[PDB]
Design a protein around this ligand. Sequence first.
Ligand SMILES: Cc1cc2nc3c(=O)[nH]c(=O)nc-3n(C[C@H](O)[C@H](O)[C@H](O)CO)c2cc1C
Ligand SMILES: Cc1cc2nc3c(=O)[nH]c(=O)nc-3n(C[C@H](O)[C@H](O)[C@H](O)CO)c2cc1C
Ligand SMILES: Cc1cc2nc3c(=O)[nH]c(=O)nc-3n(C[C@H](O)[C@H](O)[C@H](O)CO)c2cc1C
Lengths: 258, 258, 258
Amino acid sequence: MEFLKRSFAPLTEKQWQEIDNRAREIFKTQLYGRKFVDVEGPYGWEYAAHPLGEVEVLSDENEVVKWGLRKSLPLIELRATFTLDLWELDNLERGKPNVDLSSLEETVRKVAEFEDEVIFRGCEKSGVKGLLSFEERKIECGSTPKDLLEAIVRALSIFSKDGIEGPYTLVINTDRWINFLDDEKRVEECLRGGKIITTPRIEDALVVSERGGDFKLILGQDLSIGYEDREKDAVRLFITETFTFQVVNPEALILLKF
Amino acid sequence: MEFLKRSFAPLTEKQWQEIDNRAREIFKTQLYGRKFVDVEGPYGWEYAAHPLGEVEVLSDENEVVKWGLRKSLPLIELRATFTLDLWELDNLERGKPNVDLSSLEETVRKVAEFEDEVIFRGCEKSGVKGLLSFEERKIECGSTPKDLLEAIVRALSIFSKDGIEGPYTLVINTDRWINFLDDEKRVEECLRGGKIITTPRIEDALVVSERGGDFKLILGQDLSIGYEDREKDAVRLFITETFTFQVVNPEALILLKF
Amino acid sequence: MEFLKRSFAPLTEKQWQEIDNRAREIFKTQLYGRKFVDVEGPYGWEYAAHPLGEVEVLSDENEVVKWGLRKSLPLIELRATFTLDLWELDNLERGKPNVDLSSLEETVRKVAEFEDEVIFRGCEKSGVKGLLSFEERKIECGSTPKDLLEAIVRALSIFSKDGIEGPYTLVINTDRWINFLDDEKRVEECLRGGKIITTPRIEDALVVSERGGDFKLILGQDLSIGYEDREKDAVRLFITETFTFQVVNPEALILLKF
Ligand SMILES: Cc1cc2nc3c(=O)[nH]c(=O)nc-3n(C[C@H](O)[C@H](O)[C@H](O)CO)c2cc1C
Ligand SMILES: Cc1cc2nc3c(=O)[nH]c(=O)nc-3n(C[C@H](O)[C@H](O)[C@H](O)CO)c2cc1C
Ligand SMILES: Cc1cc2nc3c(=O)[nH]c(=O)nc-3n(C[C@H](O)[C@H](O)[C@H](O)CO)c2cc1C
């Protein structure tokens, strides 16, 4: 990882270990997307496109030679920077255990919010599609604590129509989960071993499968931390990665508008 | 399988694997009949009758020599054809994962519907009998969510009268299952380890056993896919098999008219 | 090479060998570009982009997170088709040595013309640059048979100014080579072991080096021949590849306008 200029920063290694261990936990908890979607292995730092397979024809018709341009998806790279003071980072070697890191977490939350917004609603500039854009997969639901049990069965019938099988899971808003609270074992038994996930991002529910191979995530470099500069008395660091995301089968996904 | 002219089709083997894997799943999910009935092994492509055992006498009475013709059941063979384009099937070798197969599934559903209609109501031309034709095995049921628990017990008594035993199962319409929804563990305990199956074909319920040997299915050739022709730019394929079905004991079967 | 549907064509292998051997020679003679430029190895049939290294920034300024899209070069794929009769292709097995192939060569010339036009003048849709577009590398020349000897020296001085060294070569129009014909050993000695190449494409001369690494050619699949169809009595075939081209150092190249 030589492109991360790590050996040129005035910090002993213990402070590096502390910073990494503090960031990893918020990434483990705050990324909802990685729980069901699938992940393809790391490639490198310079991989710069992914192939679809199609071809676009630009030539005329009455020609002896014909030609066209292949198509692909270009990755995304991001970078965020923050500042940390040196006296407080140095108080660690004297013995204090609860050192103060109060600007790391603030940006560590914004990174995750941005990524989840991309996965759930998509950005048109890069030409991606979001899970809330396949509109024609809709059913209806109610409000009384019994309507949910009915909607789950009516959805598994449509799954059974096609070839989708395997374990199922439900993804629901947090505030709506209050009304249906009094019974939970019935919901878990109707899913036939399913799991419930509650999130604050979306405003309704949706139902998905978990057999494998329907949603893919392409990573060039995982999230990493590195050095930038030395301002006056406060060191400056950054965090970065490169990624993209594709949805293969629009059939293993049902949106339950309330 | 040389009678399936497979080596004379302009497709590399990867496309064959893709097509087989796409069809197998819909067959695994959409065939309700195969779940409880029993299946006898494959024989061959030219087996053309099955023996009952009876004899029909055609001669007169005052003769020194008497003769008659044996009786049997003749199989059924079916064939369905569809067309697939070549440019889209070729986009697979360039790398695209979500190739388009939108006429395979349409007929793959009609085949299953036809077969289940034969098993459940029978065709008079071939002289078969359907599970909804043994009328004299009837009881009565109600609508309140408690009536089902009563009907199950009243049915197991009549099973206990004869020699039928072993695990039991219930087969029910999908739309009716909505009313009796609030309690499910009681139904499962009264069956003493039974299972519930919901289907959209029939309009009421019925109760069967699962010990083994009461319902048989005779297969000559399992469902298979093969080549027919090359029209202009779109290849053409077909799907086929041969089968028949018999019901031995009309006693391990109870119909609950609502 | 299974994507080239070769085993499904009604031709014995000897005719395949004959056709390949007839095409290879015209490709060996008619491609001027491959003589000095360098070639990078074959990758595959689905490689679909090449990375430059740059990054384009699209976000605003006053944001906590910043993002941008990486850039690349997309390949080119081409396909050309022709028809060959069967009676004449069959006269080969009886013994005739000079069989008639009179539509193969006609398109085999157009393919090469198209490719050389791309290398020498570039196509704006794919965003390439041609050797005749770096205008600011110009000098002047004359007409008398002595002016060429002067221009070569005046060009090698400018090469010596920078780091360019190694063997040199000259590329010249065919019709102009008539005037300077009477002396050739002097030109060859001033190049200090150089070589002269005469072409009918360009309208003037230019001087290049040959040390290695200044001009690159990226190939996905080399030129290949395959089967398409069977019309009535005349089989139909095609020829294809995928490529792109880049110019690294605009300094090892001098254009001598007459
Ligand atoms: C007793 C004492 C200890 C200090 N220790 C540190 C230290 O470990 N790191 C630091 O950046 N500044 C430290 N400072 C402050 C620093 O030496 C001084 O204020 C400079 O002017 C800050 O750039 C210390 C100051 C005092 C009086
Ligand atoms: C660049 C290009 C690539 C093509 N590739 C294919 C192909 O792989 N399979 C195909 O059936 N037709 C292909 N076609 C179309 C086909 O060669 C031509 O339109 C015939 O007339 C179709 O029968 C292609 C056409 C172009 C311009
Ligand atoms: C003696 C004889 C030999 C022939 N041999 C060939 C042959 O090798 N290939 C062919 O395509 N047609 C051949 N033809 C022509 C072909 O059999 C016939 O004209 C069909 O109607 C052409 O499609 C032959 C015709 C004759 C009279």
